[PDB]
């Protein structure tokens, strides 16, 4: 997250932290996700596609820091890793960039909701706020494009939803943005999701409900002039979601 502010997991209790084991045994952060029910985290396929084996992954919930423990945190194994059958990666964009991780502890348990661990609500189908609505993004992603490291402390910032017509203008991304995607950016282009933020929540308050509007998916650099961040448009994947979660 470029710019924005530091935060803690109480702000964003559904934020999931996803890591990948190695052979040598060392563990690296992969991507964020969002806890949509006690057993299910949602995230982005492009995060997993290159190492798609479930046993490689660890999910923490309740976590405010990247590489040190947070009191009250819970650690999960990945019981099922569901990647979208229609994923594609093109010269720019990822399509159908959505993934579900079924989590279960060494104890055989899903999450237990706490002050630091809560679920976030799914939108109503095909229902999204108006362009210019201000929404929040959260992640352990880079603070600057050129950084070599990720921040140890969770961040968030606010961005505004962009109209399709605006995003699909050749000035911006053109054809690359589809109806299954949302754009969002800061008016001065000074705050944004970046590398390591993928799969995390775009949360808007539609009505009075904090609602999971998007999943951080792609964009050219970060906090860059005419280059918004692009997010999977969750309200266009409900059937995929529920079908893969009714189980």
């Amino acid at each position: 997250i470029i710019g924005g502010e530091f935060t803690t997991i109480e702000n964003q209790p559904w934020f999931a932290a996803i890591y990948r084991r190695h052979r040598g045994g060392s563990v690296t952060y992969v991507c964020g996700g969002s806890l949509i029910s006690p057993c299910w985290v949602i995230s982005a396929t492009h995060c997993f596609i290159d190492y798609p084996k479930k046993e490689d992954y660890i999910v923490y919930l309740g976590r405010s820091r990247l590489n040190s423990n947070t009191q009250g945190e819970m650690k999960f194994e990945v019981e099922n890793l569901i990647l979208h059958k229609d994923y594609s990666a093109d010269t720019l964009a990822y399509h159908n960039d959505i993934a579900l991780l079924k989590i279960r502890s060494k104890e055989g348990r899903c999450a237990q909701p706490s002050r630091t661990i809560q679920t976030i609500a799914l939108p109503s189908m095909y229902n999204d706020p108006q362009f210019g609505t201000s929404c929040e993004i959260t992640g352990f992603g880079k603070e600057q494009s050129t950084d070599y490291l990720y921040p140890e402390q969770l961040k968030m910032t606010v961005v505004k939803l962009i109209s399709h017509r605006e995003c699909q203008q050749p000035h911006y991304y053109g054809s690359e943005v589809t109806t299954k995607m949302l754009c969002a950016a800061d008016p001065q282009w000074k705050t944004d999701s970046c590398q390591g933020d993928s799969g995390g929540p775009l949360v808007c308050s539609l009505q009075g409900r904090m609602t999971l509007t998007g999943i951080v998916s792609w964009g050219r650099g970060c906090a860059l002039k005419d280059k918004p961040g692009v997010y999977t448009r969750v309200s266009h994947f409900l059937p995929w979601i529920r079908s893969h979660t009714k189980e």
Binding site: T91, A93, Q195, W218, R220, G221
Partner: peptide, 10 residues
């Protein structure tokens, strides 16, 4: 001038 998500201009 290759573009990849995330990183930079080209």
């Amino acid at each position: 001038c290759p573009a990849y998500s995330x990183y930079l201009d080209c």
